[PDB]
Amino acid sequence: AQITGRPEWIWLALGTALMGLGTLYFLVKGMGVPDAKKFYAITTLVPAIAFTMYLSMLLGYGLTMVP
């Protein structure tokens, strides 16, 4: 879809925002108010990694990050 059928950049931005808030929320849960500490950390950094990847992606193209 070189004709840009949809703003995947915006969709990515939204997805990154969601993932970000998700990571923060997960960290809050981890803070306090199943297998290993490492596993739990990764599980709590699931949204953190997702956000990082999405941020790197949007940055790669330079659409939302570089309007």
Domain positions in the chain are: 1-67
Quick check: 59 and 67 in contact, CB under 8 A? Answer: no
Task: Go through 5-36 and write b for each residue having 16 or more CB atoms within 10 A of its CB, e for each that does not.
Answer: eeeebeebbebbeebbeebeebeeeeeeeeee
Tokens of 1: 């879809």
Tokens of 24: 């923060």
Instruction: Tell which CATH architecture fits domain 1-67.
Output: Orthogonal Bundle (1.10)
DSSP notation for the chain: -TT-SS-HHHHHHHHHHHHHHHHHHHHHHHH-----HHHHHHHHSHHHHHHHHHHHHHHHHTSSS--
Report the C-alpha dihedral over residues 14, 41, 28, 35, rounded to 10 degrees: 120
